[PDB]
Each structure stands twice: as C-alpha cells, then as structure tokens.
Symmetry: D2
Subunit: 240 residues, 4 copies
C-alpha cells in the first residue's frame, strides 16, 4: 500500500511537531499541529458512506499515533492519519512559485475521478472526458460507475483524480491502471501532502490548498462549511 510508505516518511518529519487539536468531522477531518515556527492545519475528506463502525483503537492521541494508523482497515483511523500526514506536510510545504486547469496537444482522452462540475464543464468541450463518481449525491447525466475505472483508466492520456482517492485507498489501483497516462493530477484539500512522498509514483502534479488563516478556517471546518474553509486558503499546483 502506497499510504503505508507515505506514513513511514511522514513519521520521520513529525519528530519536531506536536498535536494541538483534531476532529473526525464533516465535510473534512482535520489535525492541528505546532512547531517552533508556528502552527499548521492538515485536512482529509471524511467519507461517511465508507464508515462501518464508529470505533477507534487510539486511546492516547498523538501526532505519531495518528500517522501510524494511516494504513488502518478502519476508515476513521485512516482519515485522521491522512489529515495528520497533511498537517506535518503543510508545516514543511514550500509553495514559493506554486502554479494556480490549463495544466493539460499531448492529451486527447481524460479520466476524471470524482465529479468536479467546474473542471468537467471546461474539459468536456475540448477533450474526450470520462467522469467516475461513487457517491449517488454527486451523480450527473454524464457520470459512470467507479467499477468501470479499472477498464477505462488504461485507455486515457490524462487523469484528474479527487484527492479523496488517498483516504479510501483507491489511489494504488488508479496508478496501477494508469498504463498510458502522461499526466496524473491529485486534486483537492486531501492532497495537502508533500510532493516528495509521491516521488517514484506515476503521480505528476498535486493540486491542493494551504490554510492562510488557521483560526478562521477552523471555525468554518467546525461549522461544516466547505466554501468558508476554502476562502481561508490559497489554491496551489506543485509538480511531483
């Protein structure tokens, strides 16, 4: 599992960081950390439809304990672990010259994992697009089942996968089936991880967002507002 290798690298970076606060909440599970330079907020998308039991083996919460359960069979332990990996990453992230869609000549067929209407509408006009959605709420008249990813991914030149593919563990399959993909973009707040963690993989770019105001974003994360949390952050694209 790729998430098992990412947590090993992240635990080496969490040595000088401490856990401040956390919450397995909606729409995002977040982990607040603190170092000598200041604080950092890491998030991971909560997928309640994947939750089988509301249990957690973690008795004493800590940053190293959260990161160690990132490859757990328990989705609650994974989401808190990925959020913690992102929290350590957002503390050490270098976004100096980070690019702001026009990232895609070269590409003819695109596979979009996770229904993102603004991204889909822009690409459906100029490229052959295949949208895959698992959640029934985000279903369009153009969306296909996620069971068809295994068969369509080897035929596409570009892949735009929702960063939620990291928490549900579907990232390992997406990369394995990306036989002919020249571009693989992991987009969303769950993609807050360091690009060095994905070195060697087929992932080409990471499109996420860094929290500019931790206090205001925490208020919006606790209130369950995605746009409110998004407005307290800056969107970035960094090459792996």
């Amino acid at each position: 599992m790729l998430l098992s290798r990412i947590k090993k690298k992240a635990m080496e970076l969490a040595e000088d960081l401490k856990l401040v606060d956390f919450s397995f909440g909606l729409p995002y599970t977040w982990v607040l950390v603190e170092g000598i330079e200041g604080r950092a907020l890491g998030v991971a998308m909560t997928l309640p439809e994947e939750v089988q039991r509301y249990t957690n083996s973690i008795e004493e919460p800590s940053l190293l304990e959260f990161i160690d359960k990132a490859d757990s069979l328990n989705i609650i332990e994974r989401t808190l672990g990925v959020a913690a990996i992102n929290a350590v990453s957002q503390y050490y992230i270098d976004l100096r010259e980070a690019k702001w869609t026009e990232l895609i000549d070269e590409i003819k067929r695109i596979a979009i994992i996770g229904n993102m209407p603004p991204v889909v509408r822009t690409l459906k006009e100029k490229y052959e697009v295949y949208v895959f959605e698992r959640n029934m709420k985000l279903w369009d008249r153009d969306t296909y089942s996620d069971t068809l990813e295994y068969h369509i991914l080897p035929e596409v030149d570009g892949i735009i996968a929702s960063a939620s593919c990291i928490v549900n563990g579907t990232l390992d399959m997406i990369l394995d089936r990306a036989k002919k993909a020249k571009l693989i973009v992991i987009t969303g707040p769950t993609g807050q991880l360091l690009p060095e963690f994905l070195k060697g993989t087929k992932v080409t770019h990471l499109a996420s967002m860094k929290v500019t105001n931790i206090e205001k974003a925490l208020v919006k994360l606790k209130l369950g507002s995605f746009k409110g949390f998004e407005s307290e952050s800056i969107k970035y694209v960094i090459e792996v």
Copy 2:
C-alpha cells in the same frame, strides 16, 4: 425558518435559558455533533446525531458562532444548522438537567413496566429490537440504508402503522431530521412514547404538552475524556464517559 415545528417552540424556550451560558467549543462531526458550553457552576456537553445521508450541501449561514445563534438555527431547512442547534439546545439542557426522579434503567425495562401489545420502533436499534421482538409485536422503521434489515419497514409506512401501536420507541435523531412532529401526530392510540438516544439530552419541560411520555438519554460525567472520544469518532468511548437515564415528561 420552519416556525410550525415543535423544534421551533423548543428553541424559543432554550434561548431564554442560554442567557447565563456561553459557547466554549463546537464541531459538526461524526458520529455526533457536539456543543460545549460554560456557566457559573461549570461546563456542559450537548450532542446531536449527525445524519450525513440528509446532507445535500456543506454550507452554513452562521458567520459569528454563539450559543444563541446556534439555538436560533435549530428550525433551519439546513440539516447542518439544525444539528448544531439541537446539540446547543442539549448543551443548555445538560447544564440545567435535574435527574432526581430519573430512573437508571434501559428502554427495554421501561416497556416491561407497562401493558403493551404492539410496539413501533423508529430507528433500527438491534439490542432494543432483539429484546422486544421475543415478547411483543414489533414494527421496526429505518430511513438509513446502512442500518437496514430484512425485517425493517420503510419510514413511509410509519404514517399508516403508528396509529395502530400502543407503544413507540423513537430514536432521538427524529429531533434533528424533523420527523418528531409527524410521529406524535400519528401516535393516535399510543400510551407510551419514548425518545431514546444521546440526541434526547433536552429538558423534559420542553416536551410538556406533547404526547412524549419519557426521555431516555445520557449525561456526560467526564467532559474532557468524552470530547477526546467524540473527536476520535468513537461512540462506545463517548458512551462509557456518560450515565444513561430515563426521565418522565
């Protein structure tokens, strides 16, 4: 919002009690949304079950969070605003709750104390269902597909079956989704109506005049340890830091 709700009348009573209380912390999280409050006597933790299957959008009109702002949004069309509002009503209630005449029993024990023939169980609660299905005629209704059995009926059949039952055990989550008003209206022949679960932390005086007879809920004994488990998404961890009670209305 929806001023016709029983929840619209409960928030009006709760806002009069939230005058000497302040908001400490909150979280729209899983399995429960919680609101932490503080008064002159100490702190109180109120919870309200999060129903993600009811969430259509992740939006919130609340810009400046406060205890009175949360309670005012209890009768909102937005489930996120309702859940945070009900958790805030429960927070205020848990600060002022008097459990002198509270019975330290299970909901199944409470039913056995009366002469019931047919029971309607709203919300699939396996321990409660298993105990009652062997001694009474039980009708289980579940809205969430995850908690669905081969013996659970659709919630659309509640409207037709509730007038035929003598007892009702409704999951306290009927307060956050807005089904409580219908359940009580259709409870024509029911002599025993129990609202069970941590979302039922509300004061019994708020349900005065309604057909609700009992409130089966739990009070947090250790706020710090229960918050750790609520943030970790562990229900039994939060349940172990609380005491279950059954109180008359």
Copy 3:
C-alpha cells in the same frame, strides 16, 4: 384508512369485464397489460427499488382482481403491481374528451398561487417556476439531488405553507399521498404528475387533488419493447401527455 385501499375497491368493480394478459415488476416501471371487448390497455407504476424489503410475492395465481386487491399491501412489490393494474383498468375506461393537452407549468396561475411545493425533482418544471415563484423542491432519492432540493422529512412542515403542490405520481405507490393531502392545509392547486397517475379522476373525487397530469400509451407494442428495455424516454415517446381535472 388509506386512500389506495378505497381506490382498489372502486377499481375492482371496473375490472369485472377485463382480463390479465401480461405483467412485469421491472425498471423503470412496473407494467400490467389488460384486454377487454374493445381492445387492450397498458397501465404502469413507478418501481421504487430503495423501498423493497424482500423479493417476495404472496400472489400464486396472477389475475387482474388478485393484483388490484394487493394495492394496499405492506409489500411494495404487491403495491406496485396493484397500482399498475389499477392504472391498466383506468387506461381502458379513461375519457380524455375534456383533457387539456398542456404542460404542468402553464396550469398554475400567478393570480393567487405565491408559494409552490414540488415533490419529486423534475428539472424542466423546477427551472420554469423557480424564476417566477417561491419554490420548495423535495426529493427522497439521492440520484436526483440538485443545489435546491430538500429532504422529504421537511414536507410535513412546509406543505401547510404552500398555495400550490406539484407531486410526482410515485406518491401513490410509496403511500406518501395520504400525508401530502392531509398537510395541504392552504393549497388551492394539487397536481399529481407522472405515468403512475394513469388512474381514473373519479377515484380521487372528494380528495384535495385538483388535477391529474399523466400519459396514455398510443402504441402498446412499441412501448412494451421500451419498458422491457428499461428506457423511460422510449416509453414516453409512445404515449401522449394529458391534464385532466379531478
């Protein structure tokens, strides 16, 4: 005291000279084909798989009277086949002389109706009314969730505040029709729209329902092919939409 229990009693009196030809509990619609001295009639009801408890049926010997008698059953499979049979008998005897060949949107008037409750997400109807009226859309199925759609648990509280109601005819199969009419306190216009609304208007006499917006199958053979193939638009193209006043 369900409304569907009273409709089946009236429909069984009309199914005396009709015989069952074929049937199918299928998707998107359950259908029942009947035959009389004048010819054949096809009746449909919307299959709601999310409501299915167990794939069981107490009917051993299928007949038109047996199907109609199980229209008020607790089993959704028996209800859907029963409603489809009631519609099949209705489509044989339906009189569309004074039926209006109009859309549901042009039926409502700005003169009095200020608030509209739309039960079942119908994008063309919603888009037209949302720009001129205060609209409240309620959807139970997650597949049909928009940026304006709300939960069906809020119907009980919002229906008493609306002047007009446009309810999907699927409210007849899941048994939500009885509640919708009870909570329609201030509604002056109640329209039951969809292929499940093929039942006779006389069956809804006395109720708060004002209009029935449905469709009559013009080509039974071609529509059956499209019903068996699972195509809604293919079956819709082999029918004619009508608006009949109750």
Copy 4:
C-alpha cells in the same frame, strides 16, 4: 475486459438461436431464447443502485444485439447482455460432471485458511465464519453489516486470501476483471449465483475454478415468479449446480 471476450464466443453460439422475450426487471433481468431442441431462460442480477439513467441504445431487440452490448458502459445494456449470454449458455450447458452440492462444502480445512467473500451471503458467511478467517465485502448499503467491509478494500485484501467466493453479480457491475487480477495467492475462486449461468468454457484460462449457479427446470412457472418479483419462487423452479471451470 473479460466480458468483451465472453460476448465474442457467445455470439458464435447464438447463430442457431432466436430471441423470444426479455425484461430488465427485479430481482433479475431475464432473456428467453429458442432453438431447434427447445427453449432456455437466462438471468442476470439487476443492480438498481448502479443505474444512473434509464436509457437504452437498442432500438431493434435481438439475441446478437443484446450480446454485443454486454461490455457496454450502460449497466442496463450490460445486464440484458449478460442475461442473453446466460440464455445461450443454458441452452448448450452440459451438466454431466456437475456437482449437486453447496458452495460451503466445496472448501476443505486442510487447504484454505483465509476466505474473501464478495457479496454479503448470510448462509455462506455464517457457515464459514466459524471455521475460517473470513473477509466479507459488500457494495450495496442495504446488505451492509457492522462486520462487512467496503469494496475499496478488496484491492488490498484479495492478494492475501487462499479462497474467494464472489457473487456472480461481479460479472454485471464489471468487478470480475479486478477480483481475478488481485487473486494473487487464491487456490479456489467460486463465482456463485444465478448470474453465473454462463458456460464454463468462457472462463477457461482465467483464475476462476468453479461456477455455482442454477438451471431453470420449468421455464413457464419460473417466468411467472420472475415477473412477480419473487426470488424464492424462481429458485424453486430451478436446480442448483456446481461445475468446475
């Protein structure tokens, strides 16, 4: 896709067969065919939770047209196609070496330790959970348990199991290709259910070891029960078999 290769072989066998009747219905989609020897009924499990739109490109229904749409991106076209492949298969099926046993008795303690069960089958799960290490995966929320896991974990758990009991519905949703690719250490792979009516020769070369399905003994009585939406009524008009691939 494996279903794209199965339809090519099934279309060669549908030459002397004709379409009689069909229905995309619940619980099963069925296709009724006829040849010189008689009639055959093929079924495929309808998965309404997978249906996003109720559309079908098929204008003129035929046996070859149904089979050609078996690898379609449209679940309605796939289910009708798989039901048609099963209908052609049930006409040519040879059950001389078919075992009249349950899927549970096909597994022995001396060879298998970890079992992966795809599709929540309570009788099969209850029998195996007491003697083996079982991992149940369910995609439909209705058939979900506090003991079942998400289908996203199949990709990671399937390479660790000795045996696999997959619901034949994995053929219609399109998960069969992944299940077999992730069956790295599996010595036994059983595709169980009425959707597994297909010929064993179609799965020759694959990791699939057995096919546990059923053959309709009374077509008329089973059609009445399929149209009525009764699974047990249709099951009682059939005979369960286990044929080795």
